Design a protein around this ligand. Structure first.
Ligand SMILES: Nc1ncnc2c1ncn2[C@@H]1O[C@H](CSCC[C@H](N)C(=O)O)[C@@H](O)[C@H]1O
Length: 231
């Protein structure tokens, strides 16, 4: 069952077409409510953290971190989504080509609080973006093709400082009922991916079934939030 979606794929071009055609149902216009609940503690006592958002879309919470004085980096293959982030958050920005990745670009807020790399996360290591105190992962690990999970996890691990907090949101549902994204990523997979190098703790399990999931086929959907930290 954890293997049912093992061969499913969305490509980089499919994701870019979703943005062009406005198939962006993943986006949360009010921001993620579990992060909101856990944010203070996530940041508790710390100043000027470097925070990474994989597969960031136009995630409005990048502004939450930037407003609190933390440095934010995201990676997103869609230039449309990146430009929409800055428009929606009312921020000016520069654009620079990325010399190490053909065709790619980096978009930075005017005083540098937020830098969004327009490229694949699988190419991002060549952009020399350093390491992070915090990672917020929502619609990211669950968006990655299942076949790419090992590669994805090693990149996330390579981006962590020695001390870190890594919050990851997954969704539990019957994967024989729906072909992702968002893919089904159970606890056991999280543990396969990160548990030798991370301590884990489940923080939350919440009902996410919306009737919009009805015709999907789903009669259960729960969102789970995990906190990963140094072993
Ligand atoms: N390999 C990849 N590299 C970079 N972005 C990718 C990617 N695969 C998918 N994406 C982008 O990943 C996003 C997943 S949808 C979730 C967006 C955002 N994290 C949110 O919480 O709203 C899309 O914006 C899609 O274009």
């Amino acid at each position: 069952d954890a293997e049912v979606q093992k061969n499913q794929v969305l490509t980089l071009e499919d994701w870019k077409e979703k943005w062009v055609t406005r198939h962006i149902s993943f986006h949360q216009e009010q921001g993620h409510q579990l992060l909101k609940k856990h944010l203070d503690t996530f940041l508790k006592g710390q100043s000027g953290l470097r925070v990474f958002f994989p597969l960031c879309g136009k995630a409005i919470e990048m502004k939450w971190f930037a407003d609190r004085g933390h440095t934010v980096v995201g990676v997103e293959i869609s230039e449309i989504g990146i430009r929409e982030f800055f428009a929606e958050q009312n921020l000016s920005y520069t654009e620079e080509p990325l010399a190490e990745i053909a065709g790619a670009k980096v978009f930075k807020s005017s005083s540098g609080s937020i830098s969004l790399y327009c490229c694949s996360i699988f190419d991002l290591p060549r952009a020399n973006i350093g390491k992070f105190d915090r990672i917020w992962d929502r619609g990211a690990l669950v968006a990655i093709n299942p076949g790419d999970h090992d590669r994805y996890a090693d990149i996330i691990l390579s981006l962590l400082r020695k001390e870190f907090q890594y919050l990851v949101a997954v969704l539990s549902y019957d994967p024989t009922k729906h072909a992702g994204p968002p893919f089904y990523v159970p606890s056991a997979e999280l543990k396969r991916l990160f548990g030798t190098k991370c301590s884990m703790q489940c923080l939350e399990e919440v009902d996410a079934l919306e009737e919009r999931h009805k015709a999907w086929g789903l009669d259960y959907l729960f969102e789970k939030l995990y906190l990963l930290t140094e072993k």
